[model samples]
Target chain A: TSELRICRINKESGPCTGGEELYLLCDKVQKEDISVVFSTASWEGRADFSQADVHRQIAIVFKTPPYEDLEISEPVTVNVFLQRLTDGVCSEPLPFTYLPR
Target chain B: ASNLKISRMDKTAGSVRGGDEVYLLCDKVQKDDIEVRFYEDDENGWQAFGDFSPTDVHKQYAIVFRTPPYHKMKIERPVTVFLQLKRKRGGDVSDSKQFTYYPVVED
Candidate 1:
């Protein structure tokens, strides 16, 4: 079994109002067995995408989920990573900014 | 030569002024020897190269780059163009993909 690693993400930031599509590149993954997790200290949310959005097990096209609280005025940064459902193993996270629209 | 191909990309439309970031996934490629070429098919012969250095290539399977602005800055509507993966030393190109450029918003 290969390990999980997020190679890169297309955009580092997007509007907090969300639904922004993002393209993420990664090491080999089980398309149907993985999830993209976005989290802050007090909140965690999953990005929106179907297994069909996973391409060749190397990339995923997904939409950013709206942050837990959408009416904030300042930009909020969060951690994102690949989550394996079977073993609960997760990759090192990356930073993404959620901005007020 | 026959193995080059694009798996997918996130952007199909962007502003006419360009500078939009694009994330593309493709088959194996030499990071330092490839170029992303954007072009038009008509006699205008318009074309531009995406902006990316070698380090922008991720593990030979993906690339991150910014779009170059369209040739005309004053178009009133959307302009569709073609993009393809090209090898510098070997002159091989992958099947082209389409990207549309929309006019910049004027306030």
Candidate 2:
């Protein structure tokens, strides 16, 4: 079984105009032991959050990367997964759309 | 004519070494009447890959294509690319779908 599990993404679907903060609702675990990784069609990187950003071990809030100059004419989907720092285990990916401004 | 639009992608990212197939789910398309293409932006302009046809399964709504290898290697990290659908060569196109290509290298 996976040590990390993501249950849901807040604001499940919509346009994200870059640098916005998004939240993830997940199974409770050690609040200080995980990081949220964000992946999209054009960019992949870890979210800007640490132990202090976790809420009661059940949720995490992260900032979206600035993508105002991506030069895309369509909205892109963003995938999120949890990475447990202790043993380097990753949860399944959760996806959402990001609309560029 | 229907306005071209892409609703989502089955897989939003894959390895840059290529051969990963991703599906583009779309709307406002005509069955078996369009071609699918992929592109990546650079300092020069939007570089395009060769056009290909979609299969009978979900012909008009979903497009499946194998990702092409990146022209550059030794990427420090993953990069994003655009996948689009078109009605004809240089004609109407659906909104670009963002897809990331992760660098395939040893950790």
Candidate 3:
């Protein structure tokens, strides 16, 4: 419903490593005011994310930890699912890659 | 014949102004969550001073303390400051650092 969305990987010190995933759900924005809902965490890393709009409800996954500071050798593909809030229309999962480092 | 006394840098002896840069070098062991503090000597002893969070790769890291000039009162005769490192996750080492001064005055 807005402009651009971005996130930067913050590397941690030492050899600590692990990974985490995040799921985000957004409500329909009729008047341009959009509030994305997340289960575990809130919005971080980027500000003023309004470029690309996923008109329908969807699921976004974010990998953490082991992927934190460490470079990503191989790309990780995340699946995105779209659904309609009122009619409950769900779209097949779309694959998106994290990209190689 | 000669008498040689090689003393360490007191392990701690440096001071930073309100808006000065503070550098910290870690030991060989790995460390995380490094924090630095600034203290101004008070009547009782060294006051709590200010605190800092530093991002360090390897053992060496730097933190810039940005305290309000007015809040950083209490002039210290021999101002003292230190750096403390803590392991973020398990299996790393922790270390503490004190300031060291150089160039001794000669009479």
lDDT of each: 0.89, 0.65, 0.31
Model 2: which docking level applies? incorrect
lDDT (tens digit, per residue) of candidate 2 on B1-107: 77778765546777767667554546646555676666765675655552345442142444455667666666778888787777763488877777777888688
In model 1, residue pairs whose N, Cα or C atoms come closer than 3 Å (at least 3 residues apart or on different chains), thus clashing, are none
Candidate 1 stretches with Cα past 4 Å from truth are A15-18, A70-75, A99-101
Off by over 4 Å in 3: A1-101, B1-16, B28-32, B37-72, B88-95, B100-107
Reproduced native contacts, each prediction: 0.46, 0.00, 0.00
Write candidate 1's Cα lDDT for A6-92 as tens digits.
988878998988899998888889988999999988998999999988877878889999998899799999999999999988899
Writing each residue's lDDT as its tens digit, candidate 1 over B1-107 gives 55678888877899988989988888898899999999998998888999999988877888889999998989998999999999999989999999999999889
DockQ of each: 0.52, 0.02, 0.01
Using TM-score as the measure, name the better of candidate 1 and candidate 3: 1
TM-score of chain B of each: 0.95, 0.75, 0.34
TM-score of chain A of each: 0.95, 0.77, 0.28
Q: Which 10-residue window of candidate 3 chain A scores lowest in summed lDDT?
A: A6-15
